[PDB]
C-alpha cells in the first residue's frame, strides 16, 4: 500500500520546453515489491488515446499537455497498460509532472491529479499485479482436555 | 475496495476431531464492484493438495492441528503458484469455514486461526484503491 505526494514547482514564463518540471512527486511503499506504477488522472487527447491534457479552471480556460517524467521510469508502448513503471525495490521513488512537447501555455491555474501503487511481478503474467494489505482477522480455537 | 472479514469460532467437546467439522465460520464482504473473493490462512502448508494448512498450538510447534478452508462455491488452483481459495461471487458477502482436515486426535490447547482475504476483479487482480494526490500549478508570464 503506497503513499503518494505531489509538490508544485513554481515557474515564471510560459514558453515551456518539453521536459520542463511542473511538479515533483514521490511514491513510498514499505512492503516488499518489484517496483512502482504511477499515472496521471486526466483525459487523453484523441484516441490515440493521445497525450494527457489538463484544462485550466477558475479563470482562463486553456489546455496544457503533461506526462510523468524522471529517471528510471518506463512506459509500455503497446496500448492497454496505463501509466509509467519502474523496477525499484527500494522503498521510495521520485517522479515529476513534466511538460509534454514544446508549448506556449496560456497563463492560468492547472490542477494535476496523480495516482500510484507498488506492484509485485508475477510469473504466469498476469504481469504486474497491485499490492495492498489484505483484510485479516484471527480467532482462537480451544481443543478441550479429555478428562 | 478493501474486504471486511469476520471469523466466528465454534466450541466443541473433547479432542477427537472428525474430518469436515467446522471449527470456525468466516464471512468476507466487499461493498464495491468485484468478480469474486479470495481467502487464505496464514499458516504453514502440508502441500498435500490445496488450501490445506497446519496450525501450531499457542505453546509452540510441538502440537499441530490440520485444517482446510471449505464451503460450497470455493475453488483452488491445482498448481501451487496461486494460493488460497477463490469464488466467483459478485454479491456483497461470501461465507467460508475453517474445517478439520482429516480425522485427528488433537493435543488439548489453543490454536490460533489467522485468515486473510481480498475481493478481486477478473481481467494469472486484487482490488486496491490506489493512493491519489493533487497539486495546483500556476502558469504565468512576467509581463
Numbering used by the authors:
A (entry chain B): 0 to 146
B (entry chain A): -1 to 121, 125, 128 to 146
What does the paper say about this structure?
Enteroaggregative Escherichia coli is the primary cause of pediatric diarrhea in developing countries. They utilize aggregative adherence fimbriae (AAFs) to promote initial adherence to the host intestinal mucosa, promote the formation of biofilms, and mediate host invasion. Five AAFs have been identified to date and AAF/IV is amongst the most prevalent found in clinical isolates.
Here we present the X‐ray crystal structure of the AAF/IV tip protein HdaB at 2.0 Å resolution. It shares high structural homology with members of the Afa/Dr superfamily of fimbriae, which are involved in host invasion. We highlight surface exposed residues that share sequence homology and propose that these may function in invasion and also non‐conserved regions that could mediate HdaB specific adhesive functions.
